[PDB]
């Protein structure tokens, strides 16, 4: 139904992706101090939107809790180590 | 505390506007061609200097 599209790296040269659908909301102050700081997009001619930014990660780092709060080599380290953790690898 | 983080983010803002000014000045062909470096080099040096100053 043409609501979603496959883009490869060559093709993403010609596009402009939003990060969250909220980027498409119009604007025209009073903010939570504790939240992180997001620069306004200052771009309007969007053609696509990310499904979800967290989808940039692999299977391993998708286990890391709050990886947006740690220095990146630690995320690489945990990615290497979680493959060394024990658990039920198969129910059979 | 909230006062200190207010000051921290106002500092980040002032650095952002410093670099905005640097860039508009570069875009008007109004940089000084100080000896030994391109205009773009002077610009990059100034912006990186500003942002590192902000972080510190």
């Amino acid at each position: 139904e043409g609501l979603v599209e496959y883009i490869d790296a060559e093709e993403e040269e010609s596009i402009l992706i939003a990060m969250q659908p909220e980027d498409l909301e119009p604007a025209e102050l009073d903010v939570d101090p504790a939240k992180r700081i997001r620069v306004s997009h200052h771009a309007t001619t969007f053609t696509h939107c990310e499904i979800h930014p967290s989808m940039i990660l692999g299977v391993a780092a998708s286990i890391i809790p709050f990886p947006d709060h740690n220095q990146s080599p630690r995320n690489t380290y945990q990615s290497a180590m979680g493959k060394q953790a024990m658990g039920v690898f198969l129910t059979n | 505390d909230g006062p200190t983080m207010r000051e921290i983010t106002e500092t980040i803002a002032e650095a952002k506007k410093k670099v905005l000014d640097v860039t508009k000045e570069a875009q008007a062909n109004l940089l000084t061609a100080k000896h030994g470096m391109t205009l773009r080099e002077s610009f990059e040096d100034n912006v990186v200097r500003f942002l590192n100053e902000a972080r510190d």
């Binding site: 402009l16 992706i17 939003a18 990060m19 700081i37 967290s54 940039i56 947006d68 220095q71 990146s72 | -």
Partner: protein
Amino acid sequence: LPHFSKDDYSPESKGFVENSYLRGLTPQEFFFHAMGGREGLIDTAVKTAETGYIQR
């Protein structure tokens, strides 16, 4: 990144994390920070062998 317009020499466009680890990095800050951390890891991984050979 394809989320930026062309010719954008902004702080945030070219890899300035204005957020702290406490508050949290945005996706673009996350990816740029990852870009830097990888360079760190590779510098580690080969400096090790180069200094081993130097010491030898």
